[PDB]
Amino acid sequence: MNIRFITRNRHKIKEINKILSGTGVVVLASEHSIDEIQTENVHALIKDKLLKAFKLVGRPVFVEHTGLYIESLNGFPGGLTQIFWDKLQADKFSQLLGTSENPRLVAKTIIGYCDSMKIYIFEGETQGTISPVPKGPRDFQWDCIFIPDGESETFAEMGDRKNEISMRKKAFDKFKEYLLEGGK
Amino acid sequence: MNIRFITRNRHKIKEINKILSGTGVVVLASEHSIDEIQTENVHALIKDKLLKAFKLVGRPVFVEHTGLYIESLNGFPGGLTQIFWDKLQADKFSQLLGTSENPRLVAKTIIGYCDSMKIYIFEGETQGTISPVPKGPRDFQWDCIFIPDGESETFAEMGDRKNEISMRKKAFDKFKEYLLEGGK
Amino acid sequence: MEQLLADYKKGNVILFVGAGVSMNLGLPSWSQLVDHIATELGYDPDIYRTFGSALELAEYYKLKKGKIGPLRSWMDRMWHSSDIDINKSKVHEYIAKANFPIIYTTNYDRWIETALSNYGKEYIKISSVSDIAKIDNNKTQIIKFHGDFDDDSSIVLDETSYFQRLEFETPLDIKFRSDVLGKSVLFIGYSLSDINIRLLFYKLSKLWKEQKLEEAQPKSYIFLPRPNPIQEEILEQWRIGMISSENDNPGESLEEFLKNFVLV
Amino acid sequence: MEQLLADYKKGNVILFVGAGVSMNLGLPSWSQLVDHIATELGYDPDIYRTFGSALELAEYYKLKKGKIGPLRSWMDRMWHSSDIDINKSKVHEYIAKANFPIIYTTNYDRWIETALSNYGKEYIKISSVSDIAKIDNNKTQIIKFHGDFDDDSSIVLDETSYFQRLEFETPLDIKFRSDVLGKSVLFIGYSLSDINIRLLFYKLSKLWKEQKLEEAQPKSYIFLPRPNPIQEEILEQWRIGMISSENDNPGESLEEFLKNFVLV
Amino acid sequence: MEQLLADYKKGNVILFVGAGVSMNLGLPSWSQLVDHIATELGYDPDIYRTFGSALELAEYYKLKKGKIGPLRSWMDRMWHSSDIDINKSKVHEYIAKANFPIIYTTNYDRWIETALSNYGKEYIKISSVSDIAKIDNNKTQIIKFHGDFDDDSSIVLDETSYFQRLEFETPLDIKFRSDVLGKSVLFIGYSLSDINIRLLFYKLSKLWKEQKLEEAQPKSYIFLPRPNPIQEEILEQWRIGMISSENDNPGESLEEFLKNFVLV
Amino acid sequence: MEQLLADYKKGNVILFVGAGVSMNLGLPSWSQLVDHIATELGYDPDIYRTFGSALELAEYYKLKKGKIGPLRSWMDRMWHSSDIDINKSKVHEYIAKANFPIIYTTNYDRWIETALSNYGKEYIKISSVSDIAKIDNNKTQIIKFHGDFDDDSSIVLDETSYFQRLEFETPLDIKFRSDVLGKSVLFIGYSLSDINIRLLFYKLSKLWKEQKLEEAQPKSYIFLPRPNPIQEEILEQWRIGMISSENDNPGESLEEFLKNFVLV
Amino acid sequence: MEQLLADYKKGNVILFVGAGVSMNLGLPSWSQLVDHIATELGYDPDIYRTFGSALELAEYYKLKKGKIGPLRSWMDRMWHSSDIDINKSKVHEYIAKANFPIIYTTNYDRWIETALSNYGKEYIKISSVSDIAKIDNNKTQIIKFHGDFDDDSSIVLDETSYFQRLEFETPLDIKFRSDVLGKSVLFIGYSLSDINIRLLFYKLSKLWKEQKLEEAQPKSYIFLPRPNPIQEEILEQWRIGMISSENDNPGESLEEFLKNFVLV
Ligand SMILES: O=c1nc[nH]c2c1ncn2[C@H]1C[C@H](O)[C@@H](COP(=O)(O)OP(=O)(O)OP(=O)(O)O)O1
Ligand SMILES: O=c1nc[nH]c2c1ncn2[C@H]1C[C@H](O)[C@@H](COP(=O)(O)OP(=O)(O)OP(=O)(O)O)O1
Ligand SMILES: [Mg+2]
Ligand SMILES: [Mg+2]
């Protein structure tokens, strides 16, 4: 299956390519940096972004979105984590969110896929904890601060085994199950 | 001048009506809750929202947007302060942003106006300080936590004299100067 | 507006009715019809919105489904459900009680005829040339210009049907082309977007230009609640003036516009 | 003959008047017009009849003399001479006293309107689209289909004039093409020889055949005293029946035919 | 005629062939066809002639006999009998040996194609739109404009077929209307009496007058042996010049006219 | 698309060139023209794009500015700037080195003519009917169907211009309507969105159905890179097949498509 | 120079701009225009010089090419190429910074308006009478007296356009004929060779002679670098004095002449 991908993150392309390697499907990724909307419903937020990507391409195209949900912040981000990270980064993240009373937070990936006829939404989630100190490499955003639940290593420090338990994985496993199960 | 207004905030309508009272212009406000985009540029963020309001109305319509800019948070909000306030409110605002090393923050109002031919952008700003304790009435969002610079009273506690030094005022004074100076 | 009332009291104004009159009743809109076609063909609507506009969407539904018959059955059942009551419609009451001798419409529903028969006014419904043979001059002529739900071959909805109507060889086209000669047309609820009506009024303007009598052409009017200077200039080239209102609600604007016609 | 009176009392019969009605007033005939054109061009008539039919003879006069103006001036003076009295004409009296709402004519003379105004009946005379604007529904419409002597550009006499009228884009062509929709035409004094009228009724028959209600077309009638089975068959293909008379006098036959229409 | 030959060496002259070229061979005339129609319908010829011109007579034959098929069989057997030899025809030899790329004809007989196939000229016969698809640029286009004896539905003989050709929606009508744009037409054996050809050249003249370029319209020519100043003026309005000869025999006049085209 | 090459070596394929070919070149797009017109009329672009489609926006510029003279002047200067090199354009090179006898275009720029004169190929450029008179059969016909920057009256840009082209009475319209008779059209760079082209091919399809030979109609092809099943079905009804490419670059897809025609 | 500056600071000097102002920018000359006309008409330039002078040659290009449209398109593209920069022109800067209230020009290029908008000065461009309706008294008037590239009918290039302008019935001629009443005209880059301006100033001299007010006529001035006593005496009869320079460079002489006008 020849499915296209529109994004802004460049490392997201390499993660999706390494996850879907050897499956049979291929991804023709392109970089356009589609702006999202400020809404709480992630279904509408993935629906209009997939609409803008289908207006850009006109072929079968999928669209990913990834959201952190801080339980101490009453579930504030998710849909708008980008501006959050591109502002505070890692220095002003762990000193005021990793040292609070509730370090618990959940990270969700939602995939919106268009088969040039309909819109299909697949999602996956992992729970975790915010590190008090940033740890590991710092080339993929909030990977160096995200401790998953049941582990003591961040997703940047744990290496290539992050793409076996991560939420994007679960979401792309459901996406892969749909793509090899047929256009149902 | 008969100019229309599209918003979601209901108290914003009463503030704009009390500020523009006795001027000569009138405002026919309507409630639609237009979603914004997650962008840093506030000119594009007011331009597309005024585009959606002009697609909704088709008559001369202005659109306001109000952004807080926390200097401790590296200028994070502004364009997306709504979701911020709607998620963490006043309880999880002052305990982690009012007690830091840099309580300084600046609040900006940007007005996008369409005269059914062009797009006109007017803006105003006031600087201020975040309160360590929420103070005053709690019926207009971040008014009970915003200490302006050179004062010791919040904008909710100071009462009806908030509409003489506030940024929305400055922005609507430039808007009023344009609207009585003509369609230039 | 005053010359419109002077021509209306003389009896020289033809009423043209669009879908904006019928959207006050709670009928499905054009976008809901687009949605029904999209989920009937297996699409969701927003992904069928990037492909064509309206003619490509009714043409594609006709080509995949064979005919317009399932769609007409659905529009017949939805546009005439029992929840819609014509008695709480001030616009249809003002249309019925006014003295319009000839009424054209691009609606396929029968709510104009239902409103005329509710308030005790006799009429002749015209949708074929055999109904043109039944015209009485003491009764209202209601012409279903774009078809009715009684005949699938008469519904002008898709691109091929508009391509047939562009040649103006239909009897209803011939009747309209002579009815606009020397009579004013008042468009209510209508945006003048169908290409055959614009070509008809362009040819009428050309016709009055070839006789060197452009100042003597009757003037047409369109009531649009939302202003549009582009259309205003374009329709002013075809002697169609624009009447606008400052009310944001289109139904109450149309009520206040037709209040000048119902009374006396 | 009986169904014609049934449609006549219903008010669904259009009167079409040819030159044979005006032949009983003492007007110049068509052949006298040919003789006048031939003597004006330096010919003599019989040496000008081996060259062209008639459209060629009005076209050649227009081309040699520049315009149709001297011909229109001569036709205006001899067709309305003071020797002609409209009160001594039973055919025009039966036309005036009868009830025809719409009267068409291919004559350029004004004797139909003179007979209508002489016998105290109001009418609306239509020769331009600005006169289509003045149509009263309680008055007679007298449409000068082939022109009048008040306009040189309106007279349909020569070949280029009929070639212009073949496209059916004149306002009078559009008005006639919608008037024949659902109404019967009674041809008196007219031989149905003009090519645009035959093309108009051929396209009307094709239009009724395309809708597949060929039985429901209103039946037209032509009154010629001398019988012709060829025309009978050709006109019955266009739903135009022939009404003939055994009287050798054409004016008497027309008087006995219109006697059924003057009464009540 | 040096301008005609100068257009002829450039390949910008279309040959139009009428019934006189075929009448040189000894084929039955139009009068003999009208006589055969008359005695087939039970008339004697002359009384049948005093009923209609020729389109009404052929229309009456088609309406009484049902189709044109018995007539088509009779002209097929009479126009192609074994007594006619194409080798004893100098006119057809000069047509075949000339370099005319496009040849139109209103004849139904195949003597032009027989003449070109006799003298080794390769050609393409066009009587349908698939034959328009079979066009080669290095072969002579022979267009059977008024039909052929293979298809009864294509023969343009009676009034209804002339009306269908008057609408100009035939493929051959479209091909001719674009072939006359920027090419000269040379009429031989033809009188320019069919109303669809006259309307075609009238619309071509109106087309060149609309673009304000009537000085640059290509000049058409008609070779008539008997002079006619009326038609000379009328065809000169449509940029069709007249070539006349002093020889009383039309066959030898056409031979001497085509002598200028056969050589070199 | 093997049958496309089979008709290509015989010379029975007409090239139709749209606006995508004149885009690789770095010319201003259509939306840049919309932005220029909007800034010329005192608007800003999107506030002009919630009023009308495109024909309304050229019509409003022509009505506020009087003529399209400033618009033609700006389009003439920016569409033929000195920064554009025709040698660095593989699509125009593949167009020029191919052997297309007849090339149609809807561009007003002269880059097709510049590409063919640059690569040593002679051509005849057709924009009026005198250039139809200048047609050589051993040279490429480049027909500027929607106009040129030399004539303001020829540019088909606004709604009135498209209405005049919808009448199909232009010489270029008649030439195209007979060129599509029996030849295949290859659309490159073109979306088949102009209503006069769609009505032309609809009438061509109706023409081939009226002869009952619609299986023998020549098959047209359109090359669009992004696929569209709605257009595929609708153009498949008019005998226009879709050729799509999996490449996301439109210029590269057009280069690999026209590489099959550039060789031998 | 003294009385010229004295009438300048009162605001009573009209600036007239010819081609020699615009020749500093690297624009094509008049001779290169004649070379392009000769190349486009198949001539070589030097033989083409020996037939007419300028007006007959532009007349021949218009008559052979139909209209002036290809020449206007070429003149529009080469007169406004991207290599021409208005900031490196001290003549246009000295024109723009000067407060001339009325500016006339016979150039069809927009470099005066480009220089006026480039140096921050508001203007109103006049090329028709609807632009005369928009004259503001606090803005400078730029009048394109011999036309602009936005209108084919306005360009005064060939002898027919000069013959139309000789009658002084265009709105711009009446505007100029009243603007020269009681105002001084300063000619820069202009040789006073056009027949309409010489006849206009001859009629102005006759007008000041007929009122017995020859001494009270305002003095016009013309700046040519090369001294001509013949033009000096002939223009002195029309009260147009000569300003001459000793510098051989015409651009530097023009800059030194306009140095008195740019200052304060
Ligand atoms: O596995 C991850 N590990 C650490 N950080 C991550 C990860 N996945 C997303 N992120 C961060 C980067 C992105 O800036 C932000 C917003 O997520 P997200 O909206 O889906 O990506 P994006 O906005 O940056 O690019 P795009 O235009 O395709 O939506 O979350
Ligand atoms: O004077 C103010 N004092 C305290 N809080 C304020 C004020 N003005 C805005 N605010 C808060 C309320 C709003 O939720 C948030 C976003 O500002 P803002 O985007 O412009 O208003 P909104 O999103 O809630 O309604 P709308 O759809 O018209 O944009 O900032
Ligand atoms: Mg994003
Ligand atoms: Mg908001």
DSSP chain D: -HHHHHHHHHT-EEEEE-HHHHGGGT---HHHHHHHHHHHTT--GGGSTTT--SHHHHHHHHHHHSSSHHHHHHHHHHHT-TT--STT-HHHHHHHHS--SEEEE---S-HHHHHHHHTT--EEEESSHHHHTT--TTSEEEEETT-BTTBSTT---SHHHHHHHTT--SHHHHHHHHHSTT-EEEEES-----HHHHHHHHHHHHHHHHTT-GGGSPPEEEE-SS--HHHHHHHHTTTEEEE--S-S-HHHHHHHHHHHHH--
Of F93, F124, F123, nearest to F261 by C-alpha is F93
Give the start-end residues of each E strand in E47-90. none
The residue written with tokens 């000067």 in the block is: G98
Side-chain-side CA neighbours of residue G202 (13 Å): 9
- Across chain E, how many H-helices and E-strands are there? 14, 7
Q: Which residue of D has its CA nearest to C218?
A: D133
CB contact under 8 A, D60 and E228: no
The residue written with tokens 């049948």 in the block is: E48
Chains near B (3 or more Cβ pairs under 8 Å) = A, C, F
Contact E175, E143 (CB under 8 A): yes
Residues making up chain A, counted from first to last: 184
Q: Which ligand is nearest to the CA of A39?
A: 4
Rounded Cα distance between G37 and G71, Å, is 8
Of C156, C94, C83, nearest to C119 by C-alpha is C94
Tell me how crowded residue C162 is: count the other CB atoms within 10 A of its CB.
20
**Does the beta carbon of B87 sit less than 6 angstroms from any atom of ligand 2?**
no
The residue written with tokens 């319908």 in the block is: E41
Rounded Cα distance between C117 and D167, Å, is 41
> By CB neighbour count within 10 A (0-12 exposed, 13-18 middle, 19+ buried), where does A163 fall?
middle
Question: Which residues does residue B119 pair with via DSSP β-bridges, in sequence order?
Answer: B114
F43 CB neighbours in chain B (<8 A) are: 117-118
Contact A38, A80 (CB under 8 A): yes
Tokens of D196: 């645009």
**Does the beta carbon of A142 sit less than 6 angstroms from any atom of ligand 1?**
yes
To what resolution in angstroms was this structure determined? 3.0
Counting atoms of ligand 2 from 1, which one is nearest the CA of B49?
Answer: 29
G46 Cβ contact list (under 8 Å, min separation 6): none
Rounded Cα distance between E253 and F8, Å, is 46
Tokens of C19: 């879908």
Q: Which residue of E has its CA nearest to D238?
A: E160
Backbone torsions φ then ψ of F183, nearest 5 degrees: -140, 150
Rounded Cα distance between F90 and A20, Å, is 36
CB of G69 less than 8 A from some CB of F: yes
Experimental technique, in short, is cryo-EM
**Does the beta carbon of A9 sit less than 6 angstroms from any atom of ligand 1?**
yes
In single-letter form, the type of residue at position D28 comes to P
Of A2, A4, A59, the CB nearest to F227: A59
Residues bordering ligand 3, an ion, CB closer than 5 Å: A 82
Of G264, G263, G260, G256, nearest to G90 by C-alpha is G256
Of C150, C141, C165, nearest to C16 by C-alpha is C141
Mutate to test the pocket of ligand 1, among A66, A144, A163 (most ligand atoms within 8 A of CB): A66
Of C195, C163, C157, nearest to C58 by C-alpha is C157
Long-range residue pairs from E203-212, CB within 8 A, at least 24 positions apart, any chain: E203/E177, E204/E177, E204/E180, E204/E238, E205/E237, E205/E238, E205/E239, E207/E181, E207/F129, E207/F169, E207/F171, E208/E239, E208/F129, E211/F128, E211/F129, E211/F171
Long-range residue pairs from G54-61, CB within 8 A, at least 24 positions apart, any chain: G54/G30, G55/G158, G55/G159, G55/G162, G56/G159, G58/G157, G58/G158, G58/G159, G59/G158, G59/G159, G59/G160, G61/G37, G61/G158
B79 CB neighbours in chain A (<8 A) are: 38
3-state DSSP assignment of residue G220:
strand
DSSP state of A75: S
B7 C-alpha to ligand 4 centroid (Å): 8
